[PDB]
Design a protein around this ligand. Structure first.
Ligand code: HEM
Ligand code: HEM
Lengths: 447, 447
């Protein structure tokens, strides 16, 4: 337990680590609370230890720009290798160095504006399915669990756009990609792996992994039954393998399900707790789409206030919480020596709520992102989708998918806080950015 | 246990591996016997599995040249990472990629002809100490264990040339660098690590290592007591650390002790079992050094037949047995696809005894390396010191040290087979190239 002396010899402050555990006991208050308190106590830069792994947090916009953009291909190319992943090591978000660069090139044409434009009529059909299912619980007279309806919509969207299967999940493959697509408190296992990272090779050789070794076997034979986004990988650097075909699919499914449904639930909580914003957004939607006109590609991009609501919600709730890069070699960025093997981390949650760049950070104020004030927002302090060559590849898809769902939802319904609604919203202290109690709101039809 | 299908899908022949073990059970006959039988059975190229690690053996001189010389910096830069090494990971023979390239640059000036020329008067003193200790067992009238006297000479030489300490080991620091410098059958532990390579991180975090955690602490404080080759590392890419200072020293000690003493014992066995070669060599020594003149730098290089004896012995007994390189990326060398992660291996022992390049390989014939026939010897079939940028850095030092010992020894003594001498010499079946029974020979003074 002697890596614990690296930050003191470097002159970098931080919390004093305990033997074996490091600083992981400070995660009791939550990973995000630990980042904000370290930022207030140590200032610009600090370091801590996840067990024996040294992590260096940076808050300077120029230094964040160097890590994520300038020295990406050379120094900060890969993310932190985490617990037993098995064949998921071939996934793009997991691949490293040249194997990632190949997959990034093979999958970048999937998310072009031309491909995204052809997905609008497909995912607009499920927006109508979402509105239909939203009424049978709106006419029910009792509050709605938003994560359930948004979860079924996110799965219906990602299943048809990635492959081509069209299922109504809320009324029902789905049983293997919904229940078998949930995260039943892997927090204790993630903590033990962090404390015992040397046990990872043992779990790998035993073929033990975070995912169940069936869901993949289901998707493995499902993709094999589909032969006669999934098109681009088959039509074809280096040709993609069949097992690597499934790896990228699973990443897109988890990305399309959890991220899209979680942020949509955070948005509706802010619209219900701020009705004047909800009305102003419905007025912009009604003015751009008169008489409940169906949303289109060019239409969604015209709604300026809709973009401000999504941006402000992504400020308060950056579902990735952190950006991380592994230091491949000894470097000196912006006047600071970074030794090899240190996980450089950018605390997005803490930076999005820093009282240095934001007026009243705890307030939900869409006016920060208006055409006037948006110029004063540093793109390396507000990083909801990351930045640089390894940023979110599905940023435009996620923005388009969420906005299409928000428009169709707000065209027909209004959302008010129910008696069961937790106000203020408290965040879970686990490894995922999600509310403590599930978001429930009263839904009322507008017509 | 499914890496076992890589060579069959590549079209590469080889022995069928067992689950978990791979082909390690074929090591019962010895690592070198396994290489020769695979070469006779599969021809040019074959593959096997050390547990789950795929190893690809190559015998083509053009392909060996590409692996060791052409694509060293790009593809085949590092050797196979083996069991728990601890702080010895900073050693030059263990370092990888840019950390090795730095150490190779910092330690190459140590072995220049200018430095080697200044070491001759130092190591010639121990040649006289070796002759003195060789008489008290020659006048004893009973055979001599060559590994003991050559072991003390090799340690006395490497201790003074690396640092500056001058000790008579055979008559006595030495207790910590002799007994604590021996290999007490680590073969079962090496086998279990090969079968359980996933247990290596467990031994590392427990600070368990192949070396005793005292010998290093002795050398760590001994080097610290020496402050007031060791000069070049202190006088100073990047400056060398104090803990990395000890790592390179331990590698030089094990290299100077085992390799020098083992080959010298193999040479004297061939000179005793071939007296006409021993006489012819003594005649060349007497003609170049009249009246037992002390050997010098330029003198040793003039003895052509002495170079032929050392070369031929290094053919039959290449103490490294194999050269290995880890494939850093997917490549296609000389018309063959090499997947990433495969350990490319060059079987030096089998190639040195191949009936395709050598007439009567089992025969000790120094005439193969005469000025006439040496031109027909492919430098990539006869690779006693390796080749390319990562060849033996102490080649000229080892050649000079052994020849200086051979000259002073043959100037005074003659060596004959004793009743206890094992004829023919059989090799141990462990991981080291050493005789089955220790080499004992009758020593007689010439004056
Ligand atoms: C609100 C929705 C989303 C948010 C806020 C989000 C955010 C992020 C962030 C912060 C990163 C890390 C960037 C970095 O480290 O610099 C990332 C990476 C990534 N995201 Fe997203 N994401 C969202 C939705 C999606 C969707 C829908 C997909 C795919 C269908 C997706 C695919 C990916 C991939 C593949 C990566 C890794 C890229 C690489 O390693 O090269 N994301 N995302
Ligand atoms: C008869 C004596 C010796 C023989 C036959 C021998 C042979 C070899 C061989 C075959 C290699 C591997 C080359 C390759 O993989 O291409 C090697 C590497 C090496 N040898 Fe020797 N060696 C001897 C003595 C020594 C001595 C006396 C020293 C130092 C004092 C030494 C230092 C090294 C080092 C440092 C390496 C690794 C170089 C690197 O990784 O860059 N060797 N030797």
């Amino acid at each position: 337990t002697h890596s614990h002396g690296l930050f003191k010899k470097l002159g970098i402050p931080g919390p004093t680590p305990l033997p074996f555990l490091g600083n992981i006991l400070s995660y009791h208050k939550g990973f995000c609370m630990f980042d904000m308190e370290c930022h207030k106590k140590y200032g610009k830069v600090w370091g801590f230890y996840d067990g024996q792994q040294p992590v260096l947090a940076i808050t300077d916009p120029d230094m964040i720009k160097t890590v994520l953009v300038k020295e990406c291909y050379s120094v900060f190319t890969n993310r932190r290798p985490f617990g037993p992943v098995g064949f998921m090591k071939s996934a793009i978000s997991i691949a490293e160095d040249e194997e990632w660069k190949r997959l990034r090139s093979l999958l970048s044409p999937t998310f072009t504006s031309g491909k995204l434009k052809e997905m609008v009529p497909i995912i607009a059909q499920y927006g109508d399915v979402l509105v239909r299912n939203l009424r049978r619980e709106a006419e029910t007279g009792k509050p709605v669990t938003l994560k359930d309806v948004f979860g079924a919509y996110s799965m219906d969207v990602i299943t048809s756009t990635s492959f081509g299967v069209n299922i109504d999940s809320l009324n029902n493959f789905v049983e293997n990609t919904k229940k078998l697509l949930r995260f039943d408190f892997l927090d204790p296992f993630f903590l033990s792996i962090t404390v015992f990272p040397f046990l990872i090779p043992i779990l790998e050789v035993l073929n033990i992994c975070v995912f169940p070794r069936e869901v993949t076997n289901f998707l493995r034979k499902s993709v094999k039954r589909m032969k006669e986004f999934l098109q681009l990988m088959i039509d074809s650097h280096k040709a993609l393998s069949d097992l690597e075909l499934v790896a990228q699919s699973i990443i897109f499914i988890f990305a399309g399900y959890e991220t899209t449904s979680s942020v949509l639930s955070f948005i509706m909580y802010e619209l219900a707790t701020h009705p004047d914003v909800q009305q102003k957004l419905q007025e912009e939607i009604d003015a751009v789409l008169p008489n409940k006109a169906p949303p289109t590609y060019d239409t969604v991009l015209q709604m300026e206030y809709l973009d401000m609501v999504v941006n402000e919600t992504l400020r308060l709730f950056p579902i990735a919480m952190r950006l991380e890069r592994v230091c491949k070699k000894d470097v000196e960025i912006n006047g600071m020596f970074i030794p090899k093997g240190v996980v450089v981390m950018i605390p997005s949650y803490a930076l999005h709520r820093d009282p240095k760049y934001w007026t009243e950070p705890e307030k939900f104020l869409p006016e920060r992102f208006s055409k006037k004030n948006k110029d004063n927002i540093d793109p390396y302090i507000y990083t909801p989708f990351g930045s640089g060559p390894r940023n979110c590849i599905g940023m435009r898809f996620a923005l388009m998918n969420m906005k299409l769902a928000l428009i169709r939802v707000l065209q027909n319904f209004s959302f008010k806080p129910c008696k069961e609604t937790q106000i203020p919203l408290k965040l879970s202290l686990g490894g995922l950015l999600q509310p403590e109690k599930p978001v429930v709101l009263k839904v009322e039809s507008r017509d």
